[PDB]
UniProtKB/Swiss-Prot annotation, chain B:
UniProt name for this protein: Triosephosphate isomerase
pH dependence: Optimum pH is 7.
Top-level EC class as recorded in UniProt: isomerase
Active site: H99 (electrophile), E171 (proton acceptor)
Length: 256, 258
C-alpha cells in the first residue's frame, strides 16, 4: 500500500512572516493522530524557505516542505536560478518540476523537466513531476496517450530506482484554478495509465511504490472521492493550500 | 559627484550557511571608514535572503543587499516565481533585471526587462538594469548604437523621474567567455553613451545622478582603472564577490582612488 500525500503548492503567494502564520495555522488545525496516516507538505516560494525550515525544525513539526522549481545545474553562472543543493541544505523534502505554469510561461519542455528531475534526485530531493493535457486533447479523446507520452519524456534518462524515488502529479490543465475538477473516474483513468507506464519504465514492484497525485481544483467536497481511487495517492493542492484550516481538512480526509 | 557602488552578484552560488559566513567575512574585512566613500551590496540567491537580512539588521551592517531577478507580477499563479513584494519585506535594496544569463538561458527580452524594472520600482526596489552586446555586434563596430537601443527598450514605459531611481549595468558580453578583453576605455565609451541616452530619455540633471556600473570581469588588478573613468560609477562583480577578502579589497580600491 501507498501512504497518501497532500502537498500544498502556494505558487507566488505569501511573504516570509505570512508563511510562518500559515504553517502555524496548519500545525494547530490538524490533530497529531493524522500524520501516521497521511504525509503533509507545504511548498512555499523560495524566499520563504528559511523561515519555514527554522519553524518546522525548531518546533519539531511533522509537516514537511519543498520548493516550486530548481535549476538543472548544481551551481555557477545562472543569475536568478536556485540550486537543488540550496534546497537540500534547507531540509526540503520535495521539489516541483514541470508545473504547467512553468511549461507555459517559462518554456520548459519535457527534456528540461527530465533534467530537473535528475538534478533533484542528485541532491536527495523528491521531485514532484507534473504532467497534464490541454482541453482540446481531452476533447479529441486523446488524454491517456498524451499523458503517457509526456510522462515518458519527462522521466527520460532516469533509471528504474530513480523512478522509484519520484512522485508524479496529474494536473489536467483545464482543472487548474478553474473550479472544474476532474471527476474521480477521470482522475483514476489517467493515474492508472501512469502507473502502468511506470511499471514498464521501471518494474511492476517499483511502480506500485510510486505516489501519483491528482491536482486541479481539489477541495473538501471532492478530495475524498478522488483519493479513494485505486491509483490516486493524494493531491497537489493549489488555492486551497493558502487557508490553513481548509488545507488541514484536506489532509484529514485523505488520511481516512 | 556620484558615489561609487560595488555590487556583488553571487549568481547561483552559496547555500544559507555559506551566505552567513561570507557576509560576516566581508563585514570583518572592510574597514568602516570605507562606507562613507563607497556603497557596497551583496546579491545572493533567493534562498539566502532571509539569512542575510537577519545578519545585516542584527549586526547593523552598512552593506546592503538585493536579489537576482523578480516576476513582472505581484502575486498569483506563477509556480516557481518570486515577487518584488517578498523582496521588499526581506529588506532588499536592489534587484538585478535583464542579466545576460537570463537573456541567454531564459529568453528575456527588452520589453520583459522593462516590465520587471517597473515592478521593482513599484515595490520600492532599485533595479539594476543590465544591457550589453554580443561578439558579432562588437565585431561590426555598431556596438554603441546596439547598446543605446537595448537601453531604450529595457527602460520603456518608465517616466523621466523613474529613470532617476534605476541603476544601469553594462555587461560586455562580447568579452565574457570569448577570449576577448574589454578595457577601461571600452567601458567608458559605452557608459558615456549610456548617460547621454539617459539624458534624452529623462533630463541631463537626472542622467547625472544615475549610477552606471561596469559588469564585465572585475578584479583587484583592474577595478581601479574601471572606476577611474568619467562615466563609470562602480561594478557589478562576478566571481570575486564570492571571496570576502577579495570583495572587500575591491570596495576599498573603488573608495580610495585613484
Amino acid at each position: 500500500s501507498r501512504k497518501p500525500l497532500i502537498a500544498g503548492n502556494w505558487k507566488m503567494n505569501l511573504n516570509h512572516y505570512e508563511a510562518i502564520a500559515l504553517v502555524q495555522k496548519i500545525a494547530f488545525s490538524l490533530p497529531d493522530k493524522y500524520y501516521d496516516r497521511v504525509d503533509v507538505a507545504v511548498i512555499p516560494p523560495f524566499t520563504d524557505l528559511r523561515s519555514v525550515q527554522t519553524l518546522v525544525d525548531g518546533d519539531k513539526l511533522r509537516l514537511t516542505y519543498g520548493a516550486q522549481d530548481l535549476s538543472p545545474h548544481d551551481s555557477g553562472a545562472y543569475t536568478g536560478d536556485v540550486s537543488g543543493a540550496f534546497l537540500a541544505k534547507l531540509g526540503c523534502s520535495y521539489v516541483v518540476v514541470g508545473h504547467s505554469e512553468r511549461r507555459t510561461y517559462h518554456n520548459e519542455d519535457d527534456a528540461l523537466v527530465a533534467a530537473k528531475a535528475a538534478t533533484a534526485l542528485k541532491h536527495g530531493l523528491t521531485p514532484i513531476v507534473c504532467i497534464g493535457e490541454h482541453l482540446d486533447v481531452r476533447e479529441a479523446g486523446n488524454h491517456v496517450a498524451h499523458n503517457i507520452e509526456q510522462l515518458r519524456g519527462s522521466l527520460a534518462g532516469l533509471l528504474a530506482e530513480q523512478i522509484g524515488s519520484v512522485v508524479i502529479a496529474y494536473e489536467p490543465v483545464w482543472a487548474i484554478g478553474t473550479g472544474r475538477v476532474a471527476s474521480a473516474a477521470d482522475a483514476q483513468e489517467v493515474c492508472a495509465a501512469i502507473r502502468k507506464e511506470l511499471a514498464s519504465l521501471a518494474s511492476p514492484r517499483i511502480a506500485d511504490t510510486v505516489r501519483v497525485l491528482y491536482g486541479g481544483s481539489v477541495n473538501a467536497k471532492n478530495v475524498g472521492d478522488i483519493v479513494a481511487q485505486d491509483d490516486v495517492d493524494g493531491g497537489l493542492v493549489g488555492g486551497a493550500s493558502l487557508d490553513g484550516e481548509h488545507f488541514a481538512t484536506l489532509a484529514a480526509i485523505a488520511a481516512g
